[PDB]
Amino acid sequence: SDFNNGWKFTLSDSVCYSFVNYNPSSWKTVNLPHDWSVDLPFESTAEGCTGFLKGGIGWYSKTFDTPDNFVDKKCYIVFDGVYNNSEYWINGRKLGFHPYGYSPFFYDISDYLNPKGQENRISVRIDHSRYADSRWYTGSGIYRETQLIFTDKLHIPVWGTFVTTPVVSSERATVNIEVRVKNDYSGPRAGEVRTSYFDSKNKKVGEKLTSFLIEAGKEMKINQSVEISNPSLWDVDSPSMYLAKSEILVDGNVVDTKETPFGIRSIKFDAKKGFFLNGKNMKIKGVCLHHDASMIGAALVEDVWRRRLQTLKDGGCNAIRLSHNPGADAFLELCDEMGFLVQEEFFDEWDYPKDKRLNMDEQSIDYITRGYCEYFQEWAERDLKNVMLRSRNHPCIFQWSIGNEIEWTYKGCKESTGFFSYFWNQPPYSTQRIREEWAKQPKQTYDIGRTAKKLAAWTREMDTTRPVTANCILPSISYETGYIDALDVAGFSYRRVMYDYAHKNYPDKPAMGTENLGQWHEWKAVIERDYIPGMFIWTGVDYLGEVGTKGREWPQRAIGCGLLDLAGFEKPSFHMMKSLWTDAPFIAIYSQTANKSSYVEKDGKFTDKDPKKPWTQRLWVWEDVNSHWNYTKGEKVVVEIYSNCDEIELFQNGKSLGKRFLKDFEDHIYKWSVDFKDGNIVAKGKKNGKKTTSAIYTTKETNSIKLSVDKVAVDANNTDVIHVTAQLIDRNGRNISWEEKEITFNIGGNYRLLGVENGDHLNVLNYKSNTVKTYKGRALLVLQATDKAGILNINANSGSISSNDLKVEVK
């Protein structure tokens, strides 16, 4: 835990940094996890696919003494992730090179260590000079937590257990564990593996003891099976966790221990009926999450994600797709605790590169976009298996995904359909015709089907208890290459129109939405079909990058497709999804000028403005709708409600505007023509009896800054964070969202600025400033505690505008 503290770092290269006699004292001290690229300003001379932030070549360093009892023992240094092309040294000796940015790995450093009490030094060189080597923002550095593990020479390896539960019922659960035991002694050894099982409230619920005899140098696999009675099942509403404590015994003495958290749960994908979790037919209400926040970047700070996931959770989301790479262990541990089903991805591309600046097949070749494709042939198996070795015990995981939108990169695929000679239509070619066009294409060095088979084979060597999936952008062809035949569940990417086609032509293959637009028409298609068990919205939260393209130039730093923004504040699209996914009565009120709106009332009924852009084809980014009620007097306005209520009556200033029914609105958006005047809009709604009310009030000028805080007390553990929300209010404390202000925060006491954020995807801002422009009347400040305990006094200004005062105790 504390091994992650007190590292050194410099953004500069020199060969002599690896030598035994080099001292890095004049480098900057840092705590891991660290992403250096968010200490650099957004530069216009950088690339937009990686969010206009540079990389470069940075080094790390870490000093640690050999323990006073390092005799007949092993020492392993474990990294969860380093982005990327990293080289490792210890005490002047080269440990290795690790190309991929997202796989975990480790090094046996036991023989390299200096005698008891003396100083060892580790060095890491990180080459992110290819700073456009991704379609999204990556970060740069040791961006996830590390471990230094000391064990006995008779020990369980790192990731040395695998807990499975093949039979799960409410009376009993069969809980198996495989324990690997490595004998690094010079001669044979005898012992016992004792695995004890502990429930949520620390009561012992099972034990198994098995003898063994392992020869010198070798590894042995010990299978054990127990029966847990009346188990607490892991579910998204009730995420119960057990603890498996495996102990190596010589005589009756504990030589080594590993603790494996696990959860008891059955999962099943039926092709006719949908998906089943503990025998409940539930829809998957998923969202795609990139690994970056905004101000912290790729750095895995658990409290920053906890808040983001808590907001997604309360919006009715029960699943997360880690797009498009392996996630952090700390993030998986969070999904276990909070209750999310997790699809873990391995790769974004296989044998051939995607275009980093554009998308699809790569067009140009230059240095800064050279990605993992250089290493895939030699490294894919190691990376895939390490990911699975690290993550296969987490109960949250329920799908291994081998690829995202891979069809673009192999010649013949797109042209074997009839589309490109596709979003809203089915292939013009028949099943046999597509198959026949595929025979006629020129043979390349690599085949999508053959590589799909190898990856799926490797995946199943490590785990058969979870389905192999993939995100297929062209199902039609992938149904006939052997790519889909490799998978247990075929994920579709933006192919709602292909749901009936899968069910018509390939009915025994479970199929699902794995990347989808955040709209009702996508969800409509899922709930109308029992055989389509859910969808994953692109995206759950806004992410840096995928900009610098035609209509998304500097200074835009994110697309803005996310349900949440770069802060984690709720957007209109989040509320629309909340209305589709939650059960409690819900009403969110928005509006635009009748001119700026997408909708038109002609003779009562509402329709879409452009018939060539109807509600059935709405894409990723939601319209910039207003939540305020501060228009200019008399302006013609279109009010729109997102809601699960069957009846809503609307009231302007107390005068009724009339009841409207959800049955009428084909696009699932309530709509009212209104003539503006000051006062208030109030919506009252009923859902199968149960009532609810919401309202938007006209305000006066900006009078004050309202500061909210999420926690009024945290620990002095160098990791806990404070989230300070700033909001503009009028004289009577009504919230302002129609004018912006440059706000300056002031903080007394010992703290670390993580940064400031407003959630504007269209503009850049300095994260490490104490000043930030508000967006729709609000901003966010993120602080992190440090070593020092004390009190924090937080206030803010905008020149003449003042704020309430907040106090937070750091215990």
Numbering used by the authors: 32 to 452, 459 to 848
Published text:
determined the three-dimensional structures of these four agarases. initiated by GH86 or GH16B, which generates NAOS. depolymerized by GH86, and systematically saccharified by the exo-acting GH117B and GH2C enzymes. exo-acting β-d-galactosidases, while GH117A and GH117B are α-1,3-L-neoagarooligosaccharide hydrolases.
replaced with W657 and C598 in GH2C, respectively. to specifically accommodate the β-linked AHG residue. generate AOS products, which are substrates for GH2C. AOS by GH117B and GH2C, respectively.
